[PDB]
């Protein structure tokens, strides 16, 4: 299948720099146009940049409100799509995308988050949510205190799916941000089953594994 | 450039409805060549954007027939025949005619089910989070609908307006319910000179306010 493994975005301080690196298979990279797409919350969804064949001599489009900060480039023999970025402004922050291009942006990378931002990255506090003792219970995890985003929540590595919910982080009055991810079981297996959320957050490289207990 | 707008910004409807997004183009997108180079696309929550509808009414490999797109000139259309829990997501109409790509703004597609009351859960700050020298408090509403809920936090009986804040699920992609995670936040000192913590759940799934508490 179609893969666009996107890498190299994170924190970086306003007038930065970050070079931005697309990994494509499943397909003949070469033949096809290659584009970046942009989104955040403030203005949607935003073409960024184009790159041509080598049979159209490279030719490459930009975005005006990125022209002469941002550099598309492709090595077909690396099947790699690159965006070098510089001079961030804060405006450039959100999600970047990688996607094919044949008359529409017809397959997209997973994408990869660009903070623009002078704070410093701090890895976050986990604390339990414990259940107390009617069918069902609750506990959970309090994800508190990281920047930047994003962190993931799983529980009992990835086995325990059934009835979790990851909640969207909020903003606190301080930069940092708190999440929480709480998931409901049969209390009958409060004694019979450990439940441990595994906490993950790569912008400072911090795994942590919290036993919930009552 | 050519603008791209969307409407309306989000609908709610029932599985088995038709529903219709109309997507309007600034200038008219050129069709002399052929079909227009409109395209549909459909974000699911936390995902990235898949292509949907190309040229206007081609579905692309894979998608479903319900999902149709039909439009000229500087109005297209995008319609689903019957709606899905898995087919709520945010929906965008781009063309591909002339540089720079522009995007419509989305139109949010929810789905409309029967009401459902929350369960709710209060869970008291960890003594890890108290040795820190602050005390988080949260409230979990779980599996609701409609989303609209009125969460209050009592702290002795006392209203509480401004330290805590609130975080929704998007809908289910199987139930279509939302959840939400409210967080009352107070420093140590203002946690151990108090008692009573409840938070008051407020919804239509409710005949009357359902209060969660406990002490310490
Ligand atoms: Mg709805």
């Not at chain 1, 259940?131 to 205190?145: E, H, R």
């Not at chain 2, 459909?42 to 439009?71: A, E, T």
């Not at chain 2, 005390?135 to 009986?157: G, H, I, M, T």
């Amino acid at each position: 299948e179609v893969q666009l493994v996107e890498s190299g975005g994170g924190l970086v301080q306003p007038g930065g720099s970050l070079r931005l690196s697309c990994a494509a298979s499943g397909f003949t990279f070469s033949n096809y146009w290659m584009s970046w797409v942009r989104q955040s919350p403030e203005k949607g969804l935003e073409w960024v940049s184009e790159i041509r064949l080598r049979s159209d001599n490279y030719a490459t489009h930009y975005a005006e409100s990125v022209k002469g900060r941002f550099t598309i480039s492709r090595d077909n023999s690396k099947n790699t799509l690159y965006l070098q970025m510089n001079s961030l402004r804060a405006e450039d922050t959100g999600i970047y995308y990688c996607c094919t291009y044949f008359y529409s942006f017809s397959y997209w990378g997973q994408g990869t988050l660009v903070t623009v931002s002078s704070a410093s990255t701090k890895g976050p506090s986990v604390f339990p949510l414990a259940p107390s003792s009617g069918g069902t219970a609750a506990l959970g995890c309090l994800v508190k205190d990281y920047f930047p985003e994003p962190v993931t929540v799983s529980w009992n590595s990835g086995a325990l799916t059934s009835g979790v919910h990851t909640f969207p982080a909020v903003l606190q009055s301080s930069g940092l941000y708190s999440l929480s991810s709480v998931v409901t079981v049969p209390s009958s297996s409060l004694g019979t089953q450990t439940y441990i959320c595994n906490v993950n957050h790569k912008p400072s490289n911090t795994k942590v594994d919290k036993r919930v207990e009552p | 450039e050519l603008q791209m707008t969307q409407s309306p910004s989000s609908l709610s409807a029932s599985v088995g409805d038709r529903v219709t997004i109309t997507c309007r183009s600034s200038q008219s997108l050129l069709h002399t060549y052929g079909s227009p180079y409109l395209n549909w696309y459909l974000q699911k929550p936390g995902q990235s954007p898949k292509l949907l509808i190309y040229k206007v009414s081609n579905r692309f490999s894979g998608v479903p027939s319900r999902f149709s797109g039909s439009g000229s000139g500087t109005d297209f259309t995008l319609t689903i025949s019957s709606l899905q829990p898995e087919d709520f997501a945010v929906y965008f109409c781009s063309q591909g005619t002339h540089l720079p790509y522009t995007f419509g703004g989305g139109t949010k597609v929810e789905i409309k089910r029967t009401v459902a009351a929350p369960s709710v859960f209060i869970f008291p700050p960890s003594d890890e989070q108290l040795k820190s020298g602050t005390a988080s408090v949260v409230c979990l509403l779980n599996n609701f609908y409609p989303r609209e809920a009125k969460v209050q936090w009592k702290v002795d009986n006392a209203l509480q307006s401004g330290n805590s804040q609130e975080s929704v699920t998007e809908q289910d992609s199987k139930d279509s319910t939302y959840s939400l995670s409210s967080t009352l936040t107070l420093s140590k000192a203002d946690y151990e000179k108090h008692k009573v913590y409840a938070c008051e759940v407020t919804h239509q799934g409710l005949s009357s306010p359902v209060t969660k508490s406990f002490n310490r």
